[PDB]
Design a protein around this ligand. Structure first.
Ligand code: HEM
Ligand code: HEM
Ligand SMILES: N=C(Nc1ccc(CCNCc2cccc(NC(=N)c3ccoc3)c2)cc1)c1ccoc1
Ligand SMILES: N=C(Nc1ccc(CCNCc2cccc(NC(=N)c3ccoc3)c2)cc1)c1ccoc1
Ligand SMILES: C[C@H](O)[C@H](O)[C@H]1CNc2nc(N)[nH]c(=O)c2N1
Ligand SMILES: C[C@H](O)[C@H](O)[C@H]1CNc2nc(N)[nH]c(=O)c2N1
Ligand SMILES: [Gd]
Ligand SMILES: [Gd]
Ligand SMILES: [Zn+2]
Lengths: 405, 407
């Protein structure tokens, strides 16, 4: 078992949970590929073993291992798989599986929250219009006027003979990115492709920097259908800075609800290609990545010039000073708007507690160091000094191919 | 296959074909990645194996100088084969030593400074016989490398390990280290990283100081002898008092650091030969001092002191008081080293040069071993280009390796 050391405190643990890793990552003894964004490519006997492992996980979690109920469920799944090629989760299993998939997500620093997840069962959904109803109710619930609640809506599983439900958008709220003739982008460069797809499917584009995109929702064996989110459903936070009064004149904003909509939820061998989940933001996602990445909104140099910093030389650390003030603006602004947000110090401190909890509960915790350590102030947070073991457990959230490629 | 490597800021793709030549194995498997572990397990302690590494190294060298298959290449292979058959080991020509030292630096996956790898002064101390002579070589190294603040990269190579004879070892992890004194309540005065070496110095007859920045003596070990204590002449040890360009009280904190980072506890491996004492030096990247050495909770841990002096709100994390204090400490380090005319590189400039290194190496060797977690600076990670660069980590030889402490 891997020996895992915390270098700030000197404490050592062994990750025995890693021995239960259900899938291969990209590393080998000859070379580590832990820094790759995409670590992977993108039946009945294999389905059964994954189903049985999941059922065993479920009955262990409720302290009913070996019960008549545990045995009946194993037999039932085995017989349903033999008779139909697949099986159906019970509602309690779906809830357990969604929470486990979150708990198992190595790149998520928010997992101290994993037990608190509202699971909306949309496995009866039959149309894109109904998907939009479920999505709008999810957004309303999760937003909760700014007191954000973690939630997942689970649409019907993949099944043979039938196309997938898919949400083409990578998140439920995305700002349009409009590519300009000189190669530049107006709006969010991360969303140029989904923006062009929306336009190709009839959306009349805006021309602002923070135009909320419509949803492209795909029902089985149907082209995607375009749905506009009612603007009163999309809570947004205008960004200002508590002591840099011109900052508000930048016209920057971000949305309250991070709701990831393009990942595949895998439970017990069953695949849910549409299972959007939302929580709340860690401020560096907005203030550091979304606003200061050179290939995103890239506001760093404008902010530094407005702060009267000397941007001619790197050694004044104008980039660092400007980035800190932008993160302050995000934190101050979400708090002023009474929208749940967590700074990276509080978040990483809670993740350390989560690692402690998971060592006792499961003997380890899969974690992706490069994603857990925040993008500013890395070694000022406890996770920087914490060795981590990255491995794939199921249930899981997984990347999946885009449905237009 | 060959790992596909993407830069996510610009979208450019490379394939790392060099990783297919990786010699030793790392700690990762398909089941779980251990890339974040400081010690990728292992450590240190047949003519066939040595001859195999020697030939691969000689072949590497003669390829690098465009003389593969030449008469000189064949003659050198035969010399090495004949030396190992006669003596069980062999001797590097001085040109091969220099090449080997530079390649070991080039191959170091955790070094962000490798754009400099071809500029390395190599002092050949393989004739060294005594700890006293080791001290003379070390002082000359420090004097050359310090160069009155105009730091020059250098390595001094002491005699190789050989059967039936102890190693030369420098016990200190760096040539310049500040003492760490354990207090009666368990706290540390000075650098907590150096408590163990400080106590070893006291054990071997060093009269300790009681300051926060006492430069430690050197414990130098000649083969089969106990380590010998040597005091560095204070005029050899250039130090920079830390001040801040605008925070006038910062100077009164009495913080300082030394000019010369000179790593003295790593093993240099070239063509199967092992040099357990081969201290190397360059110059600092400022985050090493301002972020890690001074702000790590288990190092000097001064961040909250500085935040107090800055009148920051320190009982709400979301004021980002830690981040603001950290930046000003890094500003103070940069300002102070530039004021003292001591070479230093900020983390923006260093990571930008490392991207250029990656580009040079892709053309030169088809790849570059890099350890993402160590290349990305400990503050402002995604503000630097390396954050957005996928990297492949693997072990090439020649190499600098960790080795067990000699005691
Ligand atoms: C409740 C507050 C939460 C916070 C503060 C939080 C924080 C984060 C952050 C900062 C990341 C890195 C994202 C990036 O850099 O792109 C992340 C990733 C992730 N989160 Fe959480 N999260 C929360 C809730 C959730 C929930 C409710 C789920 C699912 C039920 C979830 C599943 C994931 C997954 C699967 C990833 C990996 C995404 C990827 O690989 O691209 N998180 N989270
Ligand atoms: C010339 C300026 C140089 C700069 C700015 C530089 C910068 C750095 C930094 C920031 C690290 C990480 C150290 C840490 O965080 O503890 C590092 C590691 C390293 N450097 Fe360089 N370096 C330079 C020169 C050199 C030279 C001359 C050598 C050897 C000949 C070298 C070999 C290494 C090695 C082997 C490591 C890995 C250390 C470890 O694994 O503990 N560097 N360097
Ligand atoms: N897919 C492409 N790259 C690409 C770019 C970025 C990513 C990271 C996606 N993470 C978004 C995300 C995921 C999970 C959590 C968050 N945050 C939250 N707080 C949160 C969200 C829900 O609950 C909490 C945010 C992944 C891939 C690509 C390739 C070509 O074009 C585009
Ligand atoms: N020593 C312990 N841990 C420990 C602590 C630190 C390390 C890594 C040390 N890197 C020092 C280093 C190495 C290479 C480069 C630099 N910087 C430079 N710019 C530089 C130096 C030479 O040329 C440029 C600095 C490794 C292990 C320990 C273990 C148990 O108890 C205590
Ligand atoms: C190349 C590198 O893996 C990539 O930029 C990663 C690094 N760590 C990250 N960490 C988080 N949380 N989010 C990210 O998008 C990334 N990107
Ligand atoms: C646990 C983790 O690997 C450890 O804290 C690493 C992270 N990255 C680092 N990067 C550098 N340059 N130096 C370090 O000491 C570390 N420490
Ligand atoms: Gd102001
Ligand atoms: Gd005062
Ligand atoms: Zn790995």
């Amino acid at each position: 078992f891997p020996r895992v050391k915390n270098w700030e405190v000197g404490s050592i643990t062994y990750d025995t949970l890693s021995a239960q890793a259900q899938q291969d990552g990209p590393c080998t003894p000859r070379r580590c590929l832990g820094s790759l964004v995409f670590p992977r490519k993108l039946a009945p006997e294999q389905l059964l073993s994954q189903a049985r492992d999941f059922i065993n996980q479920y009955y262990s979690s409720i302290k009913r291992s070996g019960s008549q109920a545990h045995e009946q469920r194993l037999q039932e799944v085995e017989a349903e798989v033999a008779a139909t090629g697949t099986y159906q989760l019970r509602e309690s299993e779906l809830v357990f599986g969604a929470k486990q998939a979150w708990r198992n997500a190595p790149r998520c620093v928010g997992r101290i929250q994993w037990g608190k997840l509202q699971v909306f069962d949309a496995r009866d959904c039959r149309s894109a219009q109904e998907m939009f109803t479920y999505i709008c109710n999810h957004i309303k619930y999760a937003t909760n006027r700014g007191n954000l609640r973690s939630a997942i809506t689970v649409f019907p599983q993949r099944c043979p003979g039938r196309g997938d439900f898919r949400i083409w958008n990578s998140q439920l709220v995305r700002y349009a990115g409009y590519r300009q003739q000189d190669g530049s982008v107006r709006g969010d460069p991360a969303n140029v492709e989904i923006t062009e797809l929306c336009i190709q499917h009839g959306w009349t584009p805006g021309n602002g920097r923070f135009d909320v995109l419509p949803l492209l929702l795909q029902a089985p064996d149907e082209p995607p259908e375009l749905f506009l989110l009612p603007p009163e459903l999309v809570l947004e936070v205008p960004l200002e800075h508590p002591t840099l009064e011109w900052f508000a004149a930048l016209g920057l904003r971000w949305y309250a609800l991070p709701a990831v909509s393009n990942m595949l939820l895998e439970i017990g061998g069953l695949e849910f290609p549409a299972a959007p989940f939302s929580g709340w933001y860690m401020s560096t996602e907005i203030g550091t990545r979304n606003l200061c990445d050179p290939h995103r909104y890239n506001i760093l140099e404008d902010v530094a010039v407005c702060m009267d910093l000397d941007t001619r030389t790197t050694s004044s650390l104008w980039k660092d000073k400007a980035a800190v003030e932008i993160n302050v603006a995000v934190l101050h602004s979400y708090q002023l708007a009474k929208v749940t947000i967590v700074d990276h110090h509080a978040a990483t401190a809670s993740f350390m507690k989560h690692l402690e909890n998971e060592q006792k509960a499961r003997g380890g915790c899969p974690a992706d160091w490069a994603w857990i350590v925040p993008p500013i102030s890395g070694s000022l947070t406890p996770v920087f000094h914490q060795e981590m073991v990255n491995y794939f457990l199921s249930p899981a959230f997984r990347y999946q191919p885009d449905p237009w490629k």
